[PDB]
Design a protein around this nucleic acid. Structure first.
Ligand code: SRN
Length: 50
DNA sequence: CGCCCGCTTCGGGGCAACCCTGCGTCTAATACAAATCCGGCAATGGAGTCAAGACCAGGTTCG
């Protein structure tokens, strides 16, 4: 946003144009898969999930 | 008696070898020439195929 605040022209831009959500959604998808703390639920008896 | 000056001794620095406190989207085409694929006839010419048809030789039948 701070980059394209300057390169864009004024009196034409909007928050729909300024905002790129793809690094945020890539950070979420890169956390939930392929991290240490996000593991498969160990279920072979209900004590193990707990 | 004091004094220089390199010899040894330790310090500090410097450096070489391993992990994560690591791990962004970008003008946009035109113009043209050469090379290459490929699609479709257009000569085949050699290689396979059918069929007749002849070739006797020795069992096989008949005299
Ligand atoms: C070594 C480790 C996790 C190991 C893979 C499993 C735990 C080892 C301890 C043990 O031997 O009991 C650390 O885990 C985390 C971050 C760093 C380390 O990961 C690491 O560095 C190693 C792997 C990190 C993420 C792996 C994700 C995916 O790999 C597959 C699918 C995803 O997860 C893995 C499965 C994990 C569940 C395990 O659960 C364990 C039993 C089995 O070993 C597994 C079913 C149970 O002990 C379970 O109750 C306990 C889990 C530990 C909780 C997380 C701690 C920190 C499966 C192999």
């Amino acid at each position: 946003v701070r980059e394209r605040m300057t390169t864009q022209d004024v009196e034409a831009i909007t928050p729909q144009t300024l905002i790129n959500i793809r690094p945020v959604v890539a950070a979420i998808k890169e956390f939930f898969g392929t991290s240490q703390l996000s593991q498969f639920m160990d279920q072979n008896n209900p004590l193990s999930g707990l």
